[PDB]
């Protein structure tokens, strides 16, 4: 479900620059988070937690899952995935 979803953010329209000091995952559709007037959703950004927390490899996914098992930082993933994909179904992955 979550492979590579967290690499897009609110880049400035004119330049390849992050809009704010704290970026968040974005989307091009209404259910996902939408960029403001001055920005657009561009392809590549490192990701949350400097790219350490993600689902890109099976190794990255296993480490990411183990972090949620310890109940430490799991809500940040829930909110990030909600920004990328909408909050309709993401609670079905994390609550179980």
């Amino acid at each position: 479900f979550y492979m590579g979803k967290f690499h897009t953010t609110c880049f400035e329209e004119g330049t390849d620059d992050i809009q704010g000091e704290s970026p968040a995952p974005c989307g091009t559709e209404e259910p996902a988070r939408t960029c403001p007037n001055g920005t657009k959703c561009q392809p590549y950004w490192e990701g949350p937690n400097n790219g350490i927390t993600q689902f890109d490899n099976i190794l990255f996914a296993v480490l990411t899952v183990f972090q949620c098992i310890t109940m430490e930082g799991w809500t940040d993933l829930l909110y990030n995935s909600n920004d990328a994909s909408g909050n309709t179904w993401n609670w079905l992955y994390f609550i179980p």
Binding site: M71, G73, W74, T75, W91, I95
Partner: protein, 48 residues
């Protein structure tokens, strides 16, 4: 706390303990109210 389901998620995040103490402080008195809440002054939240 806006909806029943948004409330349950808050009580599940706190049950696991994700920064529940900061949520408690955010709910205290003297917080801005919603635009459509019908209250035009910064009188929201409780010491409860």
């Amino acid at each position: 706390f806006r909806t029943f389901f948004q409330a349950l998620m808050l009580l599940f995040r706190s049950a696991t303990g994700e920064a529940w103490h900061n949520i408690m402080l955010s709910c205290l008195s003297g917080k801005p109210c919603d635009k459509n809440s019908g209250i035009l002054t910064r009188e929201c939240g409780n010491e409860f």
